[PDB]
């Protein structure tokens, strides 16, 4: 076990001790990365990449702490983006200059009978909502919105009934995690998509009916720039044809498939997260993130290719740092009884890029 | 606020009942829970989520909720039980917590 | 093999799902509860890939349901039916 940092390459070596009462599964990141290494990675790099029951995010993977002895379970690519856009899809315009295009400003001259008229106006800094844009946010399949302030939530058992599901040959399957979508609107943290985000359990968590503080709920909020909010409608459509008799009618888009001109970010990867999945299509990138008796010792080595950060940004970045306060025990270390624990789920997106 | 009796009292051993009341949007919806505050210190949690209580708290203390009125019950009153008592609940109208007026317990 | 069954039947996922939202008895007060997704309940496990598009996956059926509105203390969670679904990343 160790790591070597050479230029754009990283060599991660992981050795564990196992016991067999079978297969080996190393597919989770914290197998190959210490927290410090993981930090050393995500802070300085814009992207990285390495050089059938595994892809189901099951247990039995090598323990994060190398001194842990574990049990073998019974058997039965492009650079991942690790950056946050510094611009939002709708704001790509120059704020100082009008577009030469025009939009429809006014359908009436005011209140009265037979006020029909057409007026047009320049799209410019004054009104940025209406400017024509070359690209649009990616697809969405709506998730129900659940609040971590529970009094807010409706008093009814909607856990299975209200959850977006896909049914296949008469069997119903919950949509989890689903298309990669922003977890929540800006400023609304307390909510979280029903099956929208990955949920990791804390060290020493009970198997069933655990409370909220026992689990760690990741959020994809970083991608809210290119991707729709998972709990909101992708937008509105025109549902009819207007006339002197009939008013315009719109409707909400609860689900929207790919269109020409959609750009999006995939779901993030985490220190606890899986690395790869076997492709059974479109955009093969797996939805949970990543890339598409006896005893003994086991080692594993993986070469990682890196994409360095070239930015000209003047002001300092948001960086991933270790908390500094007086505490009972060091995060990412052992307690007095000797139990290793991972207190916070760690993402990959800190450094920034233009859109 | 939550209407709550100013003071209740009893000799040691007698069951004492504190009951606070509120609107349907207030205590009728959601739940109640009880804090006991000894003079000069922070409050302490007796009963929470209407009828349940913490391990530290003694068996005699009891809780209940019926409609828009909830009530705390103390069985076997003791001298150590002389203190201030509040019932607390979320409020959907205000979107926050609401504290009932404090009730004092005096052993006779 | 079927798309949804690609999992190992013997082992739990380390992911969690929202098993129960009303823990109380009688009052049925709103609570958050989570459970390990595992061989006990296979419908809820998080899956890397989803079935391909459908225009009415069995063509005599709906592709699935989605949530229509925001739940609230006042409003129930309401789902609609997906009759047609275009391409989504991860479809096969």
């Amino acid at each position, epitope marked *: 076990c160790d790591s070597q940092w050479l230029g754009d390459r990283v060599i991660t070596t992981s050795t564990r001790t196992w016991a067999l009462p079978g297969y080996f599964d190393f597919n989770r990141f914290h197998c190959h990365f210490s927290p410090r290494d993981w930090q050393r990675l995500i802070n300085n790099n814009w992207g990285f990449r390495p050089k059938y029951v595994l892809g189901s995010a099951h247990e039995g993977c090598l323990p994060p702490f190398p001194a842990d002895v574990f049990m073998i379970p019974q058997y039965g690519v492009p650079f991942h983006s690790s950056y946050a856009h510094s611009q939002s899809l709708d704001r790509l315009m120059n704020p100082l200059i009008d577009q030469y295009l025009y939009y429809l400003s006014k359908t009436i001259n005011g209140s009265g009978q037979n006020q029909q008229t057409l007026k047009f106006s320049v799209a410019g800094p004054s009104n940025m909502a209406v400017q024509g844009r070359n690209y649009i946010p990616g697809p969405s399949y709506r998730q129900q919105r659940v609040s971590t302030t529970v009094t807010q939530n409706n008093n009814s058992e909607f856990a299975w009934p209200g959850a977006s599901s896909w049914a296949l040959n008469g069997r119903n399957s919950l949509m989890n995690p689903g298309p990669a979508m922003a977890s929540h609107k800006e*400023g609304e943290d307390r909510f979280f998509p029903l099956s929208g985000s990955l949920i990791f359990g804390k060290q020493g968590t009970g198997r069933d009916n655990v409370d909220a503080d026992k689990v760690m709920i990741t959020n994809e909020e970083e991608i809210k720039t290119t991707n729709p909010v998972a709990t909101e409608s992708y937008g509105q459509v025109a549902t009819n044809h207007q006339s002197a008799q009939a008013q315009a009618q719109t409707g909400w888009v609860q689900n929207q498939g790919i269109l020409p001109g959609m750009v999006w970010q995939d779901r993030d990867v985490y220190l606890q997260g899986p690395i790869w999945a076997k492709i059974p299509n479109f955009h093969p990138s797996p939805l949970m993130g990543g890339f598409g008796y006896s005893t003994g010792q086991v080692s594993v080595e993986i070469e990682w290719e890196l994409q360095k950060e070239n930015s000209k940004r003047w002001n300092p970045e948001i960086q991933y740092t270790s908390n500094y306060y007086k505490s009972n025990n060091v995060e990412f270390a052992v307690n007095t009884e000797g139990v290793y624990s991972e207190p916070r789920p760690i993402g990959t997106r800190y450094l920034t890029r233009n859109l | 606020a939550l209407t709550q009796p100013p003071s209740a009292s009893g000799t040691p051993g007698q069951r004492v009942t504190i009951s606070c009341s509120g609107s349907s949007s207030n205590i009728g919806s959601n739940t109640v829970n009880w804090y006991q505050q000894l003079p000069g210190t922070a409050p302490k949690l007796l009963i929470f989520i209407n009828n349940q209580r913490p391990s530290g708290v003694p068996d005699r203390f009891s809780g209940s909720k019926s409609g828009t009125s909830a009530s705390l019950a103390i069985s076997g009153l003791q001298s150590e039980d002389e203190a201030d008592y509040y019932c607390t609940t979320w409020d959907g109208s205000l979107n926050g917590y609401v504290f009932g007026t404090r009730t004092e317990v005096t052993v006779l | 093999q079927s798309l949804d069954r690609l999992m190992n039947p013997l082992i739990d996922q380390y992911l969690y799902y929202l098993s129960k939202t009303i823990n109380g008895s009688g009052q049925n007060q709103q609570t958050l509860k989570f459970s390990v997704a595992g061989p006990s309940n296979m419908a809820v496990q998080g899956r890397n890939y989803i079935p391909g598009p459908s225009y009415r996956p069995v063509a005599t059926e709906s592709y699935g349901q989605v949530a229509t509105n925001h739940q609230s203390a006042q409003a129930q969670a309401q789902t609609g039916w997906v009759q047609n679904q275009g391409i989504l990343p991860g479809m096969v």
Partner: nanobody
Amino acid sequence: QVQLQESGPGLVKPSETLSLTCTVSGDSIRSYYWSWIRQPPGKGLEWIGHIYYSGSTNYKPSLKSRATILVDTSKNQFSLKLRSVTAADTAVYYCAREMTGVAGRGWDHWGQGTLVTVSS
């Protein structure tokens, strides 16, 4: 183990901004709401507001626009700031932790509380 301690100037001149910080020690602030509740001397309790470790914020309606709550996860400390203070704001301010990681159901732990007096 979770220990809460409030710190702040014991004395504040009228119409000055009030500032308090609560530094939790021994346990992280992650996955838990945190609230300030106030008590005037010999009077009942008011709930100021609470904040969720990721920064979501809720206030007592009457008390908005004079109050602000911030959270610093790095320092693991948690702040209240209150403006345009008056003698009506002289009270003991408590730092409490919301229960079982979910907002709206009591407070599990309580700070020692600190007295703040508005006088000149």
